[PDB]
Short mmCIF file of C-alpha atoms in Angstrom, two decimals:
data_model
loop_
_atom_site.label_atom_id
_atom_site.label_comp_id
_atom_site.label_asym_id
_atom_site.label_seq_id
_atom_site.Cartn_x
_atom_site.Cartn_y
_atom_site.Cartn_z
CA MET A 1 103.54 151.33 14.29
CA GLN A 2 101.48 150.86 17.47
CA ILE A 3 100.47 147.48 18.87
CA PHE A 4 98.54 146.60 22.03
CA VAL A 5 99.53 143.97 24.61
CA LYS A 6 96.59 142.85 26.75
CA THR A 7 97.21 141.36 30.19
CA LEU A 8 95.16 138.80 32.11
CA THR A 9 93.17 141.47 33.98
CA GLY A 10 92.55 143.39 30.73
CA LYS A 11 95.13 146.16 31.13
CA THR A 12 96.45 147.46 27.81
CA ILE A 13 100.11 148.23 27.04
CA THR A 14 100.71 150.31 23.90
CA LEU A 15 104.07 149.79 22.16
CA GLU A 16 105.87 151.56 19.31
CA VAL A 17 107.39 148.81 17.14
CA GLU A 18 108.15 148.11 13.49
CA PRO A 19 107.13 145.00 11.50
CA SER A 20 110.78 143.92 11.34
CA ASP A 21 111.03 143.83 15.15
CA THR A 22 111.54 140.38 16.63
CA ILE A 23 109.30 138.90 19.31
CA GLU A 24 112.35 139.04 21.59
CA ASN A 25 112.54 142.79 20.94
CA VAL A 26 108.86 143.24 21.82
CA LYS A 27 109.37 141.31 25.06
CA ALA A 28 112.25 143.66 25.89
CA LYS A 29 110.06 146.72 25.23
CA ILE A 30 107.53 145.25 27.67
CA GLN A 31 110.29 144.88 30.27
CA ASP A 32 110.95 148.63 30.11
CA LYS A 33 107.22 149.44 30.39
CA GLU A 34 106.19 146.88 33.03
CA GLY A 35 109.35 145.56 34.72
CA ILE A 36 108.85 141.91 33.71
CA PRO A 37 111.92 139.94 32.54
CA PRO A 38 111.41 138.45 29.06
CA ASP A 39 112.07 134.85 30.15
CA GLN A 40 108.89 135.09 32.26
CA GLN A 41 106.79 136.48 29.37
CA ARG A 42 104.76 134.57 26.80
CA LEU A 43 103.02 136.40 23.95
CA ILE A 44 99.90 135.06 22.22
CA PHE A 45 98.40 136.20 18.91
CA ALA A 46 95.49 134.51 17.13
CA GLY A 47 95.81 131.58 19.52
CA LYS A 48 99.46 130.88 18.67
CA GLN A 49 102.50 131.27 20.92
CA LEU A 50 105.12 133.58 19.42
CA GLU A 51 108.66 132.23 19.20
CA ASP A 52 111.41 134.68 20.11
CA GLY A 53 113.28 134.31 16.82
CA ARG A 54 110.43 135.31 14.53
CA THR A 55 109.50 138.87 13.57
CA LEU A 56 106.07 140.47 13.80
CA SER A 57 105.61 140.23 10.03
CA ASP A 58 106.27 136.49 10.28
CA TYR A 59 103.03 136.29 12.29
CA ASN A 60 101.14 138.82 10.11
CA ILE A 61 101.00 141.29 13.02
CA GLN A 62 100.00 144.55 11.33
CA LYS A 63 99.18 147.98 12.77
CA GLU A 64 96.83 148.29 15.76
CA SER A 65 97.12 144.54 16.33
CA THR A 66 96.42 143.21 19.83
CA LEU A 67 98.67 140.64 21.49
CA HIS A 68 98.04 138.73 24.72
CA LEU A 69 100.60 138.58 27.52
CA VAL A 70 100.61 135.56 29.85
CA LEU A 71 103.23 135.10 32.56
CA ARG A 72 105.19 131.88 33.14
CA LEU A 73 105.09 131.93 36.93
CA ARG A 74 103.10 128.87 38.04
CA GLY A 75 103.75 125.15 37.71
CA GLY B 1 83.14 123.07 64.85
CA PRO B 2 83.67 119.79 66.70
CA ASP B 3 80.15 118.58 65.89
CA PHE B 4 80.89 119.28 62.22
CA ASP B 5 84.03 117.12 62.41
CA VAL B 6 82.01 114.27 63.94
CA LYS B 7 79.63 114.30 60.97
CA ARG B 8 82.44 114.48 58.41
CA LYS B 9 84.27 111.60 60.11
CA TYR B 10 81.14 109.47 59.71
CA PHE B 11 80.46 110.91 56.25
CA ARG B 12 83.88 110.10 54.77
CA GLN B 13 84.04 106.70 56.48
CA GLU B 14 80.78 105.52 54.90
CA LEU B 15 81.87 106.93 51.54
CA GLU B 16 84.98 104.74 51.69
CA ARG B 17 82.88 101.75 52.71
CA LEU B 18 80.98 102.02 49.40
CA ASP B 19 84.05 101.89 47.08
CA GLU B 20 85.61 98.84 48.75
CA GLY B 21 86.25 96.60 45.77
CA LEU B 22 87.00 99.33 43.21
CA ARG B 23 90.25 99.14 41.23
CA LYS B 24 90.76 102.88 40.93
CA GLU B 25 92.88 104.23 38.08
CA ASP B 26 94.19 107.63 37.05
CA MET B 27 91.77 109.21 34.57
CA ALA B 28 92.96 111.95 32.23
CA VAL B 29 90.91 115.07 31.50
CA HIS B 30 92.11 117.01 28.45
CA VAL B 31 90.54 120.47 28.33
CA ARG B 32 91.21 123.89 26.84
CA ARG B 33 91.18 126.67 29.43
CA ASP B 34 88.82 128.89 27.42
CA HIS B 35 86.46 125.91 26.87
CA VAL B 36 86.87 124.22 30.24
CA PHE B 37 83.15 123.62 30.83
CA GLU B 38 82.36 122.34 27.33
CA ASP B 39 85.56 120.27 27.15
CA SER B 40 85.09 118.69 30.58
CA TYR B 41 81.47 117.93 29.68
CA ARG B 42 82.60 116.10 26.54
CA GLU B 43 85.29 114.26 28.53
CA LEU B 44 83.26 113.20 31.59
CA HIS B 45 79.47 113.35 31.15
CA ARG B 46 79.35 109.82 29.68
CA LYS B 47 81.57 108.24 32.33
CA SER B 48 79.96 105.66 34.59
CA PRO B 49 79.48 106.53 38.28
CA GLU B 50 82.17 103.97 39.12
CA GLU B 51 84.48 105.64 36.60
CA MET B 52 83.83 109.06 38.13
CA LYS B 53 85.35 107.86 41.42
CA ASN B 54 88.73 107.45 39.69
CA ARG B 55 91.57 109.85 40.45
CA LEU B 56 91.28 112.68 37.92
CA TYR B 57 94.34 114.48 36.62
CA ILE B 58 94.05 117.54 34.40
CA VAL B 59 95.97 118.38 31.23
CA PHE B 60 95.49 121.99 30.13
CA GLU B 61 96.05 122.23 26.39
CA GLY B 62 99.10 124.30 25.54
CA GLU B 63 100.29 124.64 29.15
CA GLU B 64 103.44 123.21 30.72
CA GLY B 65 101.66 122.46 34.00
CA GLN B 66 101.83 118.84 35.13
CA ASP B 67 99.02 117.87 37.49
CA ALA B 68 100.38 116.66 40.81
CA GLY B 69 97.34 118.12 42.58
CA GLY B 70 97.60 121.84 41.89
CA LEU B 71 96.07 121.67 38.42
CA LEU B 72 93.05 119.70 39.66
CA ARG B 73 92.39 122.32 42.34
CA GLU B 74 92.45 125.09 39.74
CA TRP B 75 90.27 123.01 37.40
CA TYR B 76 87.62 122.65 40.11
CA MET B 77 87.74 126.41 40.71
CA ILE B 78 87.50 127.60 37.11
CA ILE B 79 84.88 125.02 36.11
CA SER B 80 82.73 126.00 39.10
CA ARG B 81 82.90 129.64 37.98
CA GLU B 82 81.98 128.81 34.37
CA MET B 83 78.92 126.73 35.30
CA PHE B 84 77.32 129.95 36.61
CA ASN B 85 78.29 132.08 33.63
CA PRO B 86 74.87 133.37 32.47
CA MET B 87 76.01 132.71 28.88
CA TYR B 88 75.08 129.06 29.49
CA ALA B 89 71.60 129.99 30.84
CA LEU B 90 71.93 127.20 33.43
CA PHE B 91 71.99 129.45 36.48
CA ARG B 92 71.10 132.98 37.47
CA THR B 93 72.13 135.28 40.32
CA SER B 94 69.93 135.54 43.40
CA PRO B 95 69.40 139.26 44.21
CA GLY B 96 70.91 139.98 47.65
CA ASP B 97 73.91 141.16 49.71
CA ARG B 98 76.10 138.07 49.16
CA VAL B 99 75.74 136.63 45.64
CA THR B 100 74.32 133.10 45.41
CA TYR B 101 72.86 131.27 42.41
CA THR B 102 69.50 129.90 41.34
CA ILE B 103 68.55 127.44 38.63
CA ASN B 104 67.46 129.43 35.58
CA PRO B 105 63.80 128.59 34.77
CA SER B 106 64.42 129.66 31.15
CA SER B 107 67.12 126.97 30.89
CA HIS B 108 65.44 125.34 27.88
CA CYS B 109 67.18 128.21 26.11
CA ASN B 110 69.89 125.56 25.92
CA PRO B 111 68.23 122.53 24.25
CA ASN B 112 70.49 120.02 26.05
CA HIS B 113 70.21 121.77 29.43
CA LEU B 114 68.95 118.67 31.26
CA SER B 115 72.12 116.89 30.16
CA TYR B 116 74.24 119.77 31.47
CA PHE B 117 72.37 119.95 34.79
CA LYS B 118 73.09 116.28 35.50
CA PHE B 119 76.74 116.98 34.69
CA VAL B 120 76.82 120.02 36.99
CA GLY B 121 75.39 117.89 39.79
CA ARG B 122 78.00 115.25 39.03
CA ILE B 123 80.82 117.80 39.31
CA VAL B 124 79.55 119.16 42.64
CA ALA B 125 79.26 115.62 44.02
CA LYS B 126 82.66 114.72 42.54
CA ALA B 127 84.23 117.76 44.24
CA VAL B 128 82.81 116.62 47.58
CA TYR B 129 83.91 113.04 46.92
CA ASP B 130 87.44 114.28 46.13
CA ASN B 131 87.47 116.58 49.20
CA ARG B 132 88.03 119.47 46.78
CA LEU B 133 86.44 122.90 46.90
CA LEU B 134 84.30 124.91 44.49
CA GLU B 135 83.40 128.56 44.04
CA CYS B 136 79.70 127.71 44.25
CA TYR B 137 77.17 129.43 46.50
CA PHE B 138 73.53 128.32 46.42
CA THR B 139 70.36 129.53 48.07
CA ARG B 140 68.84 127.93 51.15
CA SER B 141 66.17 126.48 48.86
CA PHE B 142 68.78 124.68 46.74
CA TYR B 143 70.67 123.25 49.73
CA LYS B 144 67.38 121.95 51.16
CA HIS B 145 66.70 120.07 47.92
CA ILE B 146 70.08 118.33 48.12
CA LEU B 147 69.56 117.52 51.81
CA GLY B 148 66.06 116.22 51.11
CA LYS B 149 64.52 118.85 53.39
CA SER B 150 61.08 120.29 52.71
CA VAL B 151 61.16 123.83 51.35
CA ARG B 152 59.08 126.32 53.33
CA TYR B 153 57.87 129.74 52.24
CA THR B 154 60.20 131.29 54.84
CA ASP B 155 63.10 130.00 52.70
CA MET B 156 62.07 132.66 50.16
CA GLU B 157 63.89 135.23 52.30
CA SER B 158 67.21 133.79 51.10
CA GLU B 159 66.07 133.24 47.50
CA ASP B 160 64.61 136.74 47.03
CA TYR B 161 64.68 139.00 50.08
CA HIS B 162 62.53 141.81 48.66
CA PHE B 163 59.97 139.55 46.99
CA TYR B 164 59.71 137.70 50.30
CA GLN B 165 59.27 140.97 52.19
CA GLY B 166 56.51 141.81 49.73
CA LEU B 167 54.80 138.61 50.81
CA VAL B 168 55.02 139.47 54.51
CA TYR B 169 53.31 142.78 53.71
CA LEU B 170 50.54 141.02 51.78
CA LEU B 171 50.04 138.70 54.76
CA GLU B 172 50.26 141.57 57.25
CA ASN B 173 48.01 144.02 55.38
CA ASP B 174 44.73 144.04 53.46
CA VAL B 175 44.58 143.41 49.71
CA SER B 176 42.39 146.53 49.50
CA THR B 177 45.53 148.53 50.43
CA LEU B 178 48.02 147.26 47.84
CA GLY B 179 47.17 149.39 44.80
CA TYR B 180 47.81 146.53 42.35
CA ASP B 181 46.14 143.24 41.45
CA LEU B 182 47.31 139.66 41.97
CA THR B 183 46.08 136.39 40.48
CA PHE B 184 46.96 132.75 41.15
CA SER B 185 49.62 132.72 38.45
CA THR B 186 53.25 133.78 38.11
CA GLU B 187 55.07 135.34 35.19
CA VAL B 188 56.90 133.37 32.50
CA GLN B 189 59.66 135.77 31.41
CA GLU B 190 60.62 133.55 28.46
CA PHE B 191 60.58 136.56 26.10
CA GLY B 192 56.83 136.41 25.62
CA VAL B 193 54.06 138.92 26.23
CA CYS B 194 52.10 138.11 29.41
CA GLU B 195 52.71 134.37 29.29
CA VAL B 196 51.95 133.00 32.76
CA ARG B 197 51.94 129.67 34.58
CA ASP B 198 49.03 128.79 36.86
CA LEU B 199 49.58 128.25 40.58
CA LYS B 200 46.20 126.47 40.67
CA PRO B 201 43.66 124.96 38.25
CA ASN B 202 42.51 127.99 36.23
CA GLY B 203 44.54 130.14 38.61
CA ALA B 204 45.06 133.01 36.16
CA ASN B 205 41.30 133.70 36.29
CA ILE B 206 41.17 133.80 40.12
CA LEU B 207 41.84 136.98 42.07
CA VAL B 208 43.94 137.04 45.23
CA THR B 209 41.73 138.11 48.14
CA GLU B 210 42.08 138.12 51.92
CA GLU B 211 40.22 134.79 51.96
CA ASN B 212 42.86 133.03 49.83
CA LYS B 213 46.04 135.12 50.16
CA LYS B 214 47.73 132.65 52.52
CA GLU B 215 47.17 129.93 49.92
CA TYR B 216 48.68 132.23 47.28
CA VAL B 217 51.80 132.93 49.36
CA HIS B 218 52.29 129.19 49.86
CA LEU B 219 51.67 128.33 46.20
CA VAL B 220 53.90 131.03 44.69
CA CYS B 221 56.93 130.03 46.78
CA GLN B 222 56.62 126.32 45.99
CA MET B 223 56.51 127.36 42.33
CA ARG B 224 59.36 129.91 42.46
CA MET B 225 61.50 127.53 44.39
CA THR B 226 60.63 124.01 43.13
CA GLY B 227 57.79 123.88 40.54
CA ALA B 228 59.36 126.19 37.98
CA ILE B 229 62.62 124.19 38.00
CA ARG B 230 61.25 120.70 38.68
CA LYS B 231 62.94 118.97 35.74
CA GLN B 232 66.27 120.76 36.18
CA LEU B 233 66.39 119.89 39.89
CA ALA B 234 65.72 116.22 39.17
CA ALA B 235 68.51 116.17 36.58
CA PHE B 236 70.93 117.88 38.97
CA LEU B 237 70.12 115.59 41.90
CA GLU B 238 70.30 112.52 39.65
CA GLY B 239 73.90 113.32 38.75
CA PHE B 240 74.68 114.37 42.32
CA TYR B 241 73.19 111.28 43.97
CA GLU B 242 74.96 108.96 41.49
CA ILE B 243 78.21 109.73 43.35
CA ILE B 244 77.14 110.86 46.85
CA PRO B 245 74.15 108.86 48.15
CA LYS B 246 71.22 110.89 49.44
CA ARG B 247 71.20 109.04 52.77
CA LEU B 248 74.76 110.23 53.49
CA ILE B 249 74.72 113.88 52.40
CA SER B 250 71.46 114.59 54.24
CA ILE B 251 73.12 114.35 57.67
CA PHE B 252 74.39 117.90 57.16
CA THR B 253 72.70 121.24 57.68
CA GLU B 254 72.42 123.87 54.96
CA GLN B 255 75.34 125.82 56.45
CA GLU B 256 77.41 122.66 56.83
CA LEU B 257 76.67 121.60 53.25
CA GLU B 258 77.81 125.03 52.03
CA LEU B 259 81.08 124.73 53.95
CA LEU B 260 81.57 121.19 52.64
CA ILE B 261 81.46 122.48 49.06
CA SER B 262 83.05 125.94 49.37
CA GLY B 263 85.43 125.58 52.32
CA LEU B 264 86.06 128.22 54.95
CA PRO B 265 84.34 131.58 54.31
CA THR B 266 87.44 133.74 54.92
CA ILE B 267 91.22 133.74 54.51
CA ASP B 268 93.00 134.20 57.85
CA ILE B 269 96.54 135.48 57.23
CA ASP B 270 97.45 134.91 60.89
CA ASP B 271 96.47 131.24 60.60
CA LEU B 272 98.51 131.02 57.39
CA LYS B 273 101.48 132.66 59.12
CA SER B 274 101.58 130.16 62.01
CA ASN B 275 101.51 127.29 59.47
CA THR B 276 104.24 128.44 57.08
CA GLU B 277 107.58 126.79 56.31
CA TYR B 278 110.71 128.49 54.99
CA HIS B 279 113.61 127.13 52.92
CA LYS B 280 116.79 129.34 52.69
CA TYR B 281 114.91 132.17 54.43
CA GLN B 282 114.16 132.29 58.13
CA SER B 283 110.90 133.41 59.77
CA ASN B 284 112.67 136.68 60.63
CA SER B 285 114.46 137.31 57.33
CA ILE B 286 113.72 140.77 55.98
CA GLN B 287 111.90 139.61 52.84
CA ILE B 288 109.66 137.40 54.98
CA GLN B 289 108.82 140.36 57.22
CA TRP B 290 108.05 142.41 54.11
CA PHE B 291 105.99 139.55 52.64
CA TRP B 292 103.58 139.25 55.58
CA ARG B 293 103.33 143.04 55.77
CA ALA B 294 102.40 143.09 52.08
CA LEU B 295 99.94 140.19 52.42
CA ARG B 296 98.19 141.92 55.33
CA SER B 297 97.94 145.10 53.23
CA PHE B 298 95.81 143.23 50.66
CA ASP B 299 92.03 143.41 50.63
CA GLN B 300 89.93 140.25 50.69
CA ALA B 301 89.87 140.10 46.88
CA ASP B 302 93.66 140.27 46.48
CA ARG B 303 94.43 137.74 49.21
CA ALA B 304 92.10 135.37 47.35
CA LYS B 305 94.20 135.83 44.20
CA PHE B 306 97.32 135.10 46.26
CA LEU B 307 95.84 131.83 47.54
CA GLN B 308 95.12 130.83 43.94
CA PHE B 309 98.68 131.75 42.98
CA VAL B 310 100.43 129.35 45.37
CA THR B 311 97.82 126.59 45.92
CA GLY B 312 95.64 126.66 42.80
CA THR B 313 92.34 127.59 44.48
CA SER B 314 90.92 130.63 46.26
CA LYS B 315 89.25 128.38 48.86
CA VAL B 316 90.56 127.37 52.29
CA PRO B 317 90.17 123.75 53.49
CA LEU B 318 87.86 123.24 56.44
CA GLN B 319 90.59 122.31 58.93
CA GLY B 320 92.48 125.54 58.18
CA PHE B 321 95.93 126.12 56.77
CA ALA B 322 97.41 123.44 59.04
CA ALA B 323 95.73 120.88 56.73
CA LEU B 324 96.81 122.31 53.36
CA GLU B 325 97.06 119.29 51.07
CA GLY B 326 99.91 118.56 48.68
CA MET B 327 100.89 115.53 46.60
CA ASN B 328 101.33 112.77 49.19
CA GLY B 329 99.65 113.92 52.39
CA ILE B 330 99.83 117.32 54.07
CA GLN B 331 102.20 120.02 52.80
CA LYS B 332 101.98 123.36 54.58
CA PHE B 333 102.48 126.66 52.79
CA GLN B 334 106.20 127.07 52.11
CA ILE B 335 108.34 129.97 50.89
CA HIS B 336 111.66 129.33 49.15
CA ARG B 337 114.11 132.10 48.30
CA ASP B 338 114.69 132.55 44.56
CA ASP B 339 118.43 133.16 44.13
CA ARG B 340 118.38 133.34 40.32
CA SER B 341 117.77 137.09 40.10
CA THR B 342 116.04 139.89 41.99
CA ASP B 343 114.38 141.30 38.85
CA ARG B 344 112.25 138.17 38.41
CA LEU B 345 108.63 138.08 39.47
CA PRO B 346 107.76 135.58 42.22
CA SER B 347 106.85 132.08 41.06
CA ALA B 348 104.81 129.25 42.54
CA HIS B 349 104.44 125.47 42.40
CA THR B 350 100.77 124.96 43.27
CA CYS B 351 101.24 121.22 43.88
CA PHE B 352 103.59 121.90 46.82
CA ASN B 353 101.89 125.15 47.94
CA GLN B 354 105.35 126.64 47.42
CA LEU B 355 106.18 130.28 46.69
CA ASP B 356 109.57 131.08 45.16
CA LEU B 357 110.32 134.57 46.45
CA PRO B 358 113.37 136.52 45.22
CA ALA B 359 115.47 138.42 47.76
CA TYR B 360 114.01 141.80 46.87
CA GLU B 361 115.84 144.97 47.87
CA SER B 362 112.93 147.02 49.24
CA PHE B 363 109.45 146.56 50.69
CA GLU B 364 108.00 148.67 47.86
CA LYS B 365 109.54 146.40 45.22
CA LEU B 366 108.41 143.22 46.99
CA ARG B 367 104.83 144.47 47.38
CA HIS B 368 104.73 145.64 43.76
CA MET B 369 106.25 142.41 42.43
CA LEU B 370 103.91 140.25 44.53
CA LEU B 371 100.74 142.13 43.57
CA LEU B 372 101.69 142.17 39.87
CA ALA B 373 102.27 138.40 39.84
CA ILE B 374 99.07 137.40 41.65
CA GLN B 375 96.92 139.82 39.63
CA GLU B 376 98.34 139.12 36.16
CA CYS B 377 98.88 135.39 36.75
CA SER B 378 96.16 134.29 39.17
CA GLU B 379 95.46 131.38 36.79
CA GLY B 380 97.42 129.56 34.11
CA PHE B 381 100.43 127.22 34.33
CA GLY B 382 103.44 128.30 32.29
CA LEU B 383 105.87 126.12 34.24
CA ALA B 384 106.01 122.36 34.69
#
């Protein structure tokens, strides 16, 4: 299954994941494709922040879904 | 330069004379980032002028950021960019080299536009009252209206350079040589077929000739620049003057008023470098040498994103980087070494103008990590 992670500038990152994958797993697959440590990543879907313990199916993230990546860098 | 400082010294002093006897309080502004203009309008457009002079602090919904100054600077920046979003039909872009904005004559598209124009004028005046900076750029016509100066037809060169240079040709040449016709009316592009507004009593039935072309040039510019937006200007200036009195703001020139609202027109890395502080690193540490090399390798658009990253706004204060403001007083740009890990992206605390920079192992990695952070996190507060 392919999902899309959209960055602030609009760049798209295509991932190969399964509905049983955890949000922590998806953040790790982004680290290998963009070099960003997971503890600096925050994923948004349908206006809700995704907790690391939940799976994709727990958020009803089906095929070709688009997630939003925001970075936790500024205070 | 120095003459500008003399005006601002008098300007700020008289502003502080007028709020003697005001028990100022901290006033919260709860907004969503994707609705920052609508939310701030709901939260502030019914505040009294005395209430508007309170110290605002911003709470972005769903964001860990705590406003000690850095969130307010970003709020001013992103709200000033959303006021000119054409989706609100409040403003339009003036055609030219540098992009400036004009009041949209079709603003009754939005039924409550006069309410929003007064709010936009309030925000601009509030930004000047707070000594904060906006990403606003107006035409010479608009600045003259704020300064109470009379608008001349020569000011059309800044509003519309090519339309103005069509008027010089009409004045310079004969109407028999144009190849088209002109009447004493101007077009109403409100999605109607040949709906026009008269520049004169029964002006649509009067042809422009050599006997009256000078009167036409004068009448069309007063319309394009004040008549067509008369009600929207009055609403804007009403909200603006409620906070900054007209007698005080009018001491400035159009160029000075633009600098007062937008700050310095460029980002000088050399000026930033001579006003930088370091904690755990030294001015000659290798990552600091790589940092300045990377910052200098950025174009004007990317160094703006960097300024937003560490301070909250893309704008430079008028006194330069030696006057960068923090929480209590002046806090220069500072770089702290991040010892946690070298695989982390750089982080920033916009309230202290502080950049947490990991001890990267190569110039290529530092430049890549820095550009990724400032481009993919130019806005948004994920940390406290």
